[PDB]
Amino acid sequence: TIKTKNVDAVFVEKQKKILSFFQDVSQLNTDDEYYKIGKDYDIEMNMDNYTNKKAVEEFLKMYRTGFMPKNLEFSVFYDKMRDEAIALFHLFYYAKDFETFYKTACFARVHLNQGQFLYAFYIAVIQRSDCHGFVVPAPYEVYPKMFMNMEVLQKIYVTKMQDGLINPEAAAKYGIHKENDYFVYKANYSNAVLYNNEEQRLTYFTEDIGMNAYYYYFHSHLPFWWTSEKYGALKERRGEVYFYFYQQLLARYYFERLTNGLGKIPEFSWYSPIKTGYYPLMLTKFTPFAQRPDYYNLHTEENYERVRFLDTYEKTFVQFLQKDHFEAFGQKIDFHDPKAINFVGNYWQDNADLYGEEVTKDYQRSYEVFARRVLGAAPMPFDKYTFMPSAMDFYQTSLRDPAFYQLYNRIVEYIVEFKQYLKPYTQDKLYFDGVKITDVKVDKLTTFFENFEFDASNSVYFSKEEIKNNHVHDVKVRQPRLNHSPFNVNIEVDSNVASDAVVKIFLAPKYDDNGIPLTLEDNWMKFFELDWFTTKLTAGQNKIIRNSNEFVIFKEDSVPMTEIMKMLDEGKVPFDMSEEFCYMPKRLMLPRGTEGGFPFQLFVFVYPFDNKGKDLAPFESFVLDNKPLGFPLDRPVVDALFKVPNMYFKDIFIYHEGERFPYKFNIPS
Amino acid sequence: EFKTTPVDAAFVEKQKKILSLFYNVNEISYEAEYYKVAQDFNIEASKDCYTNMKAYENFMMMYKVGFLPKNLEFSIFYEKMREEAIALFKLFYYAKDFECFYKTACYARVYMNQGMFLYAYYIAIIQRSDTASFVLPAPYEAYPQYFVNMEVKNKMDYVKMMDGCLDEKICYNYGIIKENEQFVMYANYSNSLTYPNNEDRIAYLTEDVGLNAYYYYFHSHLPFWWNSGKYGAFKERRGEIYFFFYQQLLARYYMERLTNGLGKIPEFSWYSPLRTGYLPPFNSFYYPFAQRSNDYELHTEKNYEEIRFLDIYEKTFFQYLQQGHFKAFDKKIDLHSSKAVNFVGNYWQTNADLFEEDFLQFYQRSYEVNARRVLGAAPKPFNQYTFIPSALDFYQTSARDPAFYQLYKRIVQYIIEFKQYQVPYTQEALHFVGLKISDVKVDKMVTFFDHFDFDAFNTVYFSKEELKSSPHGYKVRQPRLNHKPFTVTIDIKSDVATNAVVKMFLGPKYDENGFPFSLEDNWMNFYELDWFVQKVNPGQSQITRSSTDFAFFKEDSLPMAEIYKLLDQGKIPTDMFNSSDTMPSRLMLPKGTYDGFPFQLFVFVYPYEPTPKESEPFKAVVPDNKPFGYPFDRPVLPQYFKQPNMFFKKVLVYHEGELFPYLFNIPH
Ligand SMILES: *[C@@H]1O[C@H](CO)[C@@H](O[C@@H]2O[C@H](CO)[C@@H](O[C@@H]3O[C@H](CO[C@H]4O[C@H](CO)[C@@H](O)[C@H](O)[C@@H]4O)[C@@H](O)[C@H](O[C@@H]4O[C@H](CO)[C@@H](O)[C@H](O[C@@H]5O[C@H](CO)[C@@H](O)[C@H](O)[C@@H]5O)[C@@H]4O)[C@@H]3O)[C@H](O)[C@H]2NC(C)=O)[C@H](O)[C@H]1NC(C)=O
């Protein structure tokens, strides 16, 4: 049951070519075609194959000075590395056509750093208009080192060195099985071996390979360092997207807190220690990730300069708030204008659009970059190419760190402060003339854990022979992930006059920790959007049914790249990998329930789909509306002036079936 | 409904005399019996009302000077007041017969500070062997100001000032109603303005009137300041009781924490900020109770000396342990004997036994007292009779403050470090040769909240006319935790007919993580539920045992109104007489979940060894030479706990009705 889609042999060929770059990523098959091309490809000679003369010359000047060497860890948060990554991005992006693009990537694969290559390649494929419709495999299949602890990795390594198992039945005791010609390794979350604070309750969520892969997709669809000029309409809305993404992510995460009895995301100070440490169990082929003990004093000698920066960055904003109206960055900004959200978001991401430029520049110091460094607790980089990575140097790992959520909670809250300048909507804007919701009904909402496997083959090094015969796909990791049963939502509406309408579905908490009901006044930002759609109303009474698996904001699991090869032989590609790349995985839609049924609420909004004066189709097939994202919960609400006949709040309860605890799935018997 | 005991008429006269000093404690009725008797009681010319000339003349020395004046706060923790309280206790306790005791109490009831009187009087009733079996009203009826939140107290005061209700419907909306010409005031547990942190999840256990009263009774049954000579053979096991009492309580408390998602009791340092604050909604005549903010620095100027005292008090203990062969206050004591456990508890309590004297002496400084003063956060006393109260100043209010459980958990951790020197029980010491528990089954264990009344009449003031009629009728009503009765069914096979002891314990199954506990790490987290002697038959037999019969829990106290009504039938509530010092039944179970909260029940069966007849100070002291808490009184080697005559059952605790107590105090 995988949503498919049919394709021609020209596609399959290009698609196989694109996919070839993701196989055995840390090595060279000097037999493969990609090698022959790559070895000899003369870039200077091919200058006429690029849309941009100077991007080629800028690159070639960079390349003659030398790029980041092989094997070292790449991260986009460091100046010289970013600039090489962008330089290579441009080269990919300005390739005349596919042929040129492909030969260019072959060169880059053979000669450049692999994390650098992959980072740029990945973005290029999402960005090149002639690649829209193509499929890239899951980031966890591409960087499996980033999506798994030391324990699994070492087992995998041990098995490769021995070239199999010395003892099938001793292997079984270690969660290592042979099925077919595959090695399957069971893997626990890190709390099964480490419980250093309460945040360890949530590792099935923060360590979820889907969630982390999600954040890397989000970054790749629009890098902070690149303008959004290519997405037209989205440009005047970039800041709003930035807010909305984090606001959503944090509501979802907060929900996981409530069901695990953990309450609000803690605030911190640049001048005080921060409470909760992180102790990464991840390995870099060159180094260990940095640890932040509990009660880490943010303000020590090595941070004095970085913290002076963060503080002014924040204070300048407090000053914008106090000023209401002001000229910043060559733009007059007014805080009572809701459109100022563009500037607000851009300011916090320090993205290229803040300056109205193509690419950010070194001297445009980023707040997020320096927060990540400060909170990362790493010692100072050794040189331009050599740093001590923390979870927060990578999009693939950021969600693993409790401090990640505290950082962006911080930024979101400051944005909420600005939101207080927006007038709350009146009756008039929210009221659907002659339309009323009479009931909403939901199927039982249940969560449960079920096993999930992925190809971890890139973490392993193969011999010259194995690379030839192409036995290079034999390592799978088995890990319990959260999931939920499909459920329906019945909306019963009355309308006297037939007309087109938008239906919106939101999920929210019902109580704080004291068990007092959520007022809207305080809690409008803790609402999580489940679904957007339209229907045709008729005079009288209608029943609208919508399945959880028709929900537009979520996708199915990626399929392993091995299965994509099987399918491409039939002329098929899985739909959700192609145009639903960067949505959250469906299985993580709901927070883990409790066995007695945890109290939430479901909010259902129905409003007229008038025309489509302005609709998002550029980056996201998202707001086909002139409506702010998260409409109507995009600004502070007044309980009294808010509720109208076309809104319905229904009390809902989230259950859980089978084992409550992931580790219970990895016990050998 | 409640267990009663038939009671004779001579008893009814006396019990009535006792109860009568508890009416309108805050005022004097010029025409009550007690006042006339006090007017007529010449303290000077009655040396011959007392067993002990020294006690008498000691009292007179102090009396001719003057005592703590009326209306000020009394606390046993300040020296001059304690010494006054103890002088009064001595008089009460060395009174030749009941009539002399009655006359003295009347005298004190009129001429002395009421907190001081009530304190010595409770204690006296419990200790005098001619009053042994007499009943006391619950402390919450005797001191309602320590058990009523301020909000409710002000509501009560304003109805008294208005002399009733403006109109029912206004008052109903403030949670004030009339039943049978009596006022009922609905009371919530406090919100985050008094618990400014997660500890507020637990307000329904920590502010519970039963649990606070429980602790007061415990103190009154053997006060730190008195020797235990009264109880003979028990003297050699006092320090044992101290550990056991606090280990049990912390085990109970951690279990409530667990069901509310809250984790380990936090550790602290005298040199560091204490995380969890508390703002008491109480006040004395002069002062609101001291508040302790979140992140309160313990180490400030005013605490420097106290902290140096506390710090070395602990490290002295460590030095004993380091030395093995310790020796304070007369003897050399060996760590592997039990003269040791006695010493340990006494040491942490600085009780009169530690120094082997009758009463604690003026200059003997207490660890607990100094800790309580540091954690209580109050500014220093104005003079010796006037201090600024905090929750830690009273046994009636101590259990409300999260720091209370942290201080006692620290002391318990230290004692446990000593238990590392005790020899663990072997296989042979735990095996009941010839006997096997083959199964255990339990009924649904279900918690719920339901309403609870008591008379708070003792903190409303009344006119001269109203006092002639001893007026009550100001009731506070609170949702309170509770459980449905259940039965435990034990299946036994033995080879031979023998007398056995059956014990039950409740402990956690999983830590906050969701991992199973090991016995080695969990033995201190079990609290005892029941103890009883069973006659086993040879072969296959079956023991059923209802929760309403558990040895270590009591029914709810009755209000005095009911006590007099029962007295008029020659009836008395068994549980108020035979076991006041025992935890209330309704709190036997931590709050469950709709779900069913995972815990575990330990049933242990061992031989009964005939131990003769005593008359000890608590119901925890059971007719058995075994350690209290046995076989969980010391560190465990888990391989020895798979004895045929032991059994661990997973039980789940459910909850029914509303999960939140405030849902019961909502008007319409
Ligand atoms: C505003 O604030 C001020 C200052 O804080 C406060 O003033 C204080 O008032 C209290 C009383 O309300 C004063 O205390 C009284 O003082 C007299 C005399 O004190 C001096 O003489 C003593 C002996 O001569 C000496 O020993 C003292 O040290 C002092 O120098 C006392 O005689 C008062 O009576 C006693 O009070 C006690 C009863 O609670 C008893 O211990 C004592 O014995 C009893 O007395 C009767 C006779 O009446 C006897 O027959 C019995 O045997 C019985 O046992 C006696 O009654 C009392 O201590 C205090 O001194 C004032 N402070 C200052 C600095 O002057 C105001 O009251 C406050 N005003 C308001 C409106 O709040």
Ligand SMILES: *[C@@H]1O[C@H](CO)[C@@H](O[C@@H]2O[C@H](CO)[C@@H](O[C@@H]3O[C@H](CO)[C@@H](O)[C@H](O[C@H]4O[C@H](CO)[C@@H](O)[C@H](O)[C@@H]4O[C@@H]4O[C@H](CO)[C@@H](O)[C@H](O)[C@@H]4O)[C@@H]3O)[C@H](O)[C@H]2NC(C)=O)[C@H](O)[C@H]1NC(C)=O
């Ligand atoms: C993920 O995380 C969970 C939680 O951390 C892990 O779950 C744990 O899995 C353990 C197995 O790896 C399990 O331990 C076993 O418990 C069973 C049940 O009591 C025992 O039978 C096992 O004992 C055998 O191995 C011991 C040492 O390895 C020996 O000392 C012992 O002798 C025994 O061997 C057998 O017993 C006979 C002795 O008479 C011997 O003759 C015979 O030949 C046998 O071989 C293990 O102790 C943990 O209990 C379990 N934890 C929990 C809480 O359930 C999970 O493994 C992790 N998964 C992955 C994939 O990493």
